[PDB]
Design an enzyme around this catalytic site. Structure first.
Site, mmCIF file in Angstrom:
data_model
loop_
_atom_site.group_PDB
_atom_site.id
_atom_site.type_symbol
_atom_site.label_atom_id
_atom_site.label_comp_id
_atom_site.label_asym_id
_atom_site.label_seq_id
_atom_site.Cartn_x
_atom_site.Cartn_y
_atom_site.Cartn_z
ATOM 1 N N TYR A 149 -57.253 11.595 -68.503
ATOM 2 C CA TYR A 149 -55.925 11.217 -68.012
ATOM 3 C C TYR A 149 -55.208 12.421 -67.443
ATOM 4 C CZ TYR A 149 -55.671 6.449 -69.802
ATOM 5 O OH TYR A 149 -55.848 5.088 -69.917
ATOM 6 N N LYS A 199 -69.296 8.379 -75.851
ATOM 7 C CA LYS A 199 -70.497 8.154 -75.042
ATOM 8 C C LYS A 199 -71.318 9.421 -75.079
ATOM 9 C CE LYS A 199 -73.027 5.467 -72.331
ATOM 10 N NZ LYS A 199 -73.524 4.045 -72.670
ATOM 11 N N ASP A 231 -69.912 1.244 -74.906
ATOM 12 C CA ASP A 231 -70.429 -0.008 -74.416
ATOM 13 C C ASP A 231 -70.786 -0.904 -75.664
ATOM 14 O OD1 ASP A 231 -73.826 0.972 -73.273
ATOM 15 O OD2 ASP A 231 -72.602 1.876 -74.910
ATOM 16 N N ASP A 255 -57.915 3.305 -74.784
ATOM 17 C CA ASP A 255 -57.226 2.370 -73.859
ATOM 18 C C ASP A 255 -57.985 1.011 -73.877
ATOM 19 O OD1 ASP A 255 -55.318 1.612 -71.825
ATOM 20 O OD2 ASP A 255 -57.102 1.797 -70.415
ATOM 21 N N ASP A 259 -57.144 -2.615 -76.306
ATOM 22 C CA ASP A 259 -56.937 -3.909 -75.583
ATOM 23 C C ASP A 259 -57.913 -5.012 -76.005
ATOM 24 O OD1 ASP A 259 -54.655 -3.323 -74.014
ATOM 25 O OD2 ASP A 259 -55.690 -3.975 -72.135
HETATM 26 C C1 LIG Z 1 -50.148 1.866 -67.766
HETATM 27 C C2 LIG Z 1 -51.329 2.756 -68.193
HETATM 28 C C3 LIG Z 1 -51.255 4.156 -67.543
HETATM 29 C C4 LIG Z 1 -51.480 2.843 -69.734
HETATM 30 C C5 LIG Z 1 -52.693 3.707 -70.145
HETATM 31 O O1 LIG Z 1 -53.705 3.642 -69.473
HETATM 32 O O2 LIG Z 1 -52.544 4.385 -71.189
HETATM 33 C C6 LIG Z 1 -51.586 1.503 -70.390
HETATM 34 O O3 LIG Z 1 -52.799 0.813 -70.008
HETATM 35 C C7 LIG Z 1 -51.532 1.723 -71.828
HETATM 36 O O4 LIG Z 1 -52.567 1.416 -72.459
HETATM 37 O O5 LIG Z 1 -50.562 2.106 -72.473
HETATM 38 C C1 LIG Z 2 -78.802 4.959 -72.612
HETATM 39 C C2 LIG Z 2 -77.520 5.083 -71.758
HETATM 40 C C3 LIG Z 2 -77.652 6.473 -71.089
HETATM 41 C C4 LIG Z 2 -77.377 4.008 -70.686
HETATM 42 C C5 LIG Z 2 -76.222 4.160 -69.667
HETATM 43 O O1 LIG Z 2 -75.168 4.622 -70.259
HETATM 44 O O2 LIG Z 2 -76.243 3.686 -68.512
HETATM 45 C C6 LIG Z 2 -77.346 2.573 -71.333
HETATM 46 O O3 LIG Z 2 -76.133 2.378 -72.102
HETATM 47 C C7 LIG Z 2 -77.395 1.539 -70.292
HETATM 48 O O4 LIG Z 2 -76.469 0.676 -70.132
HETATM 49 O O5 LIG Z 2 -78.363 1.425 -69.531
HETATM 50 CL CL LIG Z 3 -60.652 10.347 -71.882
HETATM 51 MG MG LIG Z 4 -54.027 0.096 -71.753
HETATM 52 MG MG LIG Z 5 -74.995 0.663 -71.648
#
Ligand SMILES: CC(C)[C@H](C(=O)O)[C@@H](O)C(=O)O
Ligand SMILES: CC(C)[C@H](C(=O)O)[C@@H](O)C(=O)O
Ligand SMILES: [Cl-]
Ligand SMILES: [Mg+2]
Ligand SMILES: [Mg+2]
Ligand SMILES: [Cl-]
Lengths: 369, 368
Positions: A149, A199, A231, A255, A259
């Site tokens: 950020y 990650k 992921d 973030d 959510d």
């Molecule tokens: C509006 C945006 C910049 C903010 C963020 O990404 O932190 C929002 O998504 C949040 O989560 O508070």
């Molecule tokens: C193993 C990892 C490096 C890989 C990636 O992050 O793309 C996996 O999560 C994927 O989705 O294929």
């Molecule tokens: Cl970050």
């Molecule tokens: Mg957010």
């Molecule tokens: Mg993946």
């Protein structure tokens, strides 16, 4: 601003856009009840922020509003943003424009977003019923002032087809250590588990994150640490949300994870957000937005803003019994079936309570002690 | 290497865990398909992943890389396992094979198709009134740019100011090539592209959204919307039937594809395409090597089998052969040929083995 014993506490009130002002009114109604009850001297100073400040002052974070937050013990914040101002340049929009500079200026490195399924509302969750019946209560701890950020280089150079943009994710050991300590202290007081989301198979920042998290984890031997890739974490929150306690995340990953968990409750109008610095100053706000499509109709759910005030009392003002009183009054409303429209079926619209009916009930329930 | 009017060349990289056993079912299905359509295909097998570590001392042997270079496409299994997870990070199966493959071969395009199969909507972890409506979402992920391959990366300093960094970078050329594929994909589906970014925070997402708007003008029949990553994670829960094609950067597509895969509740059905601009690609199950069931004949081979169908369509341009495999797998799933994990434990006796599934699907293609 340092508080002196017996002085009034100072709250900067930044209600913002959309439903902000109408739910802020209900938070002030419930705060007036608490003030009278637990015997408090609190003063409030209102300031424009967001689209309201663009409309009145020509920018989303006026210097006078920054100075007003600097003079207060804590900020009770509503919500900012709306279609009126989304045509505007980027640095100029209410959310990017007010929230990133607030966080940076006050060094609000710590975001905490508590979410749970409330008794009897498990059904509004979008999870399959056998999963939502199991319940969940997940506190998301997100590092708010570092990572991608705020990192530089950040910008756009070059030309023709090769013109490129760039952003830099950055984390130091000091930044990871402070946020990890809040996640472990939280976990120590909850169910003693931290899930750190990174990650680390791709990013250098996440290899360092995971190292420093393991360092801090030594000081909290009662608490279980596990690591999960971002992921996979989106998948595991769907399949087994009852197995997580505190999530510990970087700025971008928090973030996202906060959510996803918020939507898994199916009751986002109940959810509040804490953004604090190391001196105990913070801003407290609903997780949901300014909902401009219903602004002014008295149908918005004010529980998130009310809970925001309870968390401000607990975290910044250290007025513990005042906080728990609000939380108890909210829970009594929800279990006595005082629900706003978005927590009822569309066929039960006429049993829905308005914004002000909800605040009246909760304020009355505070007076009942 | 390009294809000339001669035999097609496929390189087979089964990997670890369940890789070999489900690859066996894929090779069975391919044999049926080559017979029915009179295809001319040559295959070469190569160690990759932990198999390659154990046999050759590294996860992507030079012989394996060259064997892929010589092929029209790669049929890939899965790699990884707890035996290798203790090694230095660049020596491990996944990081050590997948990221070098993608970089070497310029596989900028990742496509992960996901849908609720008829009669398996209940598998989804979504509330029934949502899952019963169905969904089908194709995730287009940019695979060789952004923060995965951006430089610089690494560390500086010492003690409290030890710091790490990674750099997300995207050029107009890289955004335009992956946007085109999403728009072409949408034109053939339900004519909607949802571009997922964080343009309120990242300079790369401001440039992504600008270049996507440029490309969209060339596809005036396709609806374009933008959505921020955090919000996309919430909207995919509540209304997955409203999405068609997702168009994502590399890290955002890694996250969005995984959430959608888990929304199906049937990850054993899901395949992944990684391709370059020449039509060369690697085709593999989205799921991993599952070593705790390896050798039991319990693994679901449908993702591997469908990987071979997608290889036939996208790299070989053999559409009828691809459609055949897809029809056979759909027949099996609707005729009570389901593996372990698609049935309640109480109904385990009704479940099919890995080879029972391959047999049935190969048998079905052998029927016009
Ligand atoms: C509006 C945006 C910049 C903010 C963020 O990404 O932190 C929002 O998504 C949040 O989560 O508070
Ligand atoms: C193993 C990892 C490096 C890989 C990636 O992050 O793309 C996996 O999560 C994927 O989705 O294929
Ligand atoms: Cl970050
Ligand atoms: Mg957010
Ligand atoms: Mg993946
Ligand atoms: Cl990226």
């Amino acid at each position: 601003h340092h508080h002196h014993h017996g002085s009034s506490y100072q709250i900067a009130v930044l209600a913002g856009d959309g439903i902000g002002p109408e739910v802020m009114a209900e938070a002030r109604k419930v705060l007036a009840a608490v003030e009278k009850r637990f015997d408090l001297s609190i003063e409030y100073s209102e300031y424009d922020v967001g689209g309201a400040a663009i409309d009145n002052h020509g920018c989303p974070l006026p210097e006078a509003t920054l100075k007003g937050c600097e003079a207060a013990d804590a900020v009770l914040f509503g919500s900012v943003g709306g279609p009126k101002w989304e045509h505007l340049p980027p640095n100029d929009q209410p959310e990017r424009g007010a929230l990133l500079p607030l966080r940076g200026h006050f060094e609000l490195f710590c975001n905490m977003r508590p979410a749970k399924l409330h008794p009897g509302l498990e059904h509004m969750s979008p999870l399959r019923s056998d999963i939502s019946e199991k319940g969940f209560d997940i506190l998301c701890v997100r590092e708010l002032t570092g990572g991608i950020y705020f990192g530089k280089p950040k910008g756009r150079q070059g030309e023709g087809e090769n013109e490129e943009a760039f952003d830099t994710m950055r984390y130091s050991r000091k930044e990871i250590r402070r946020i990890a300590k809040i996640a472990f202290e939280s976990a120590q007081g909850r169910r003693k588990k931290v899930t750190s989301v990174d990650k680390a198979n791709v990013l250098a920042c996440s290899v360092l994150w995971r190292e420093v998290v393991e360092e801090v984890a030594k000081d909290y031997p009662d608490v279980e640490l596990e690591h999960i890739y971002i992921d996979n974490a989106t998948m595991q929150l769907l399949r087994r949300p009852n197995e997580f306690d505190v999530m510990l995340c970087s700025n971008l990953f928090g973030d996202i994870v906060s959510d996803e968990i918020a939507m898994l409750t199916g009751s986002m109008g109940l959810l509040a957000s804490i953004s604090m610095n190391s001196q105990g100053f913070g801003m407290y706000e609903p997780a949901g937005g300014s909902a401009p499509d219903i602004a002014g109709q008295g149908i918005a759910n004010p529980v998130a803003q009310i809970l925001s005030a309870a968390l401000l009392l607990r975290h910044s003002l250290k007025l513990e019994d005042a906080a728990l009183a609000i939380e108890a009054a909210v829970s009594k409303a929800l279990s006595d079936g005082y629900l706003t429209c978005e927590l009822l079926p569309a066929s039960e619209r006429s049993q829905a309570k308005s914004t002000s009916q909800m605040g009246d009930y909760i304020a009355q329930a505070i007076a009942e002690g």
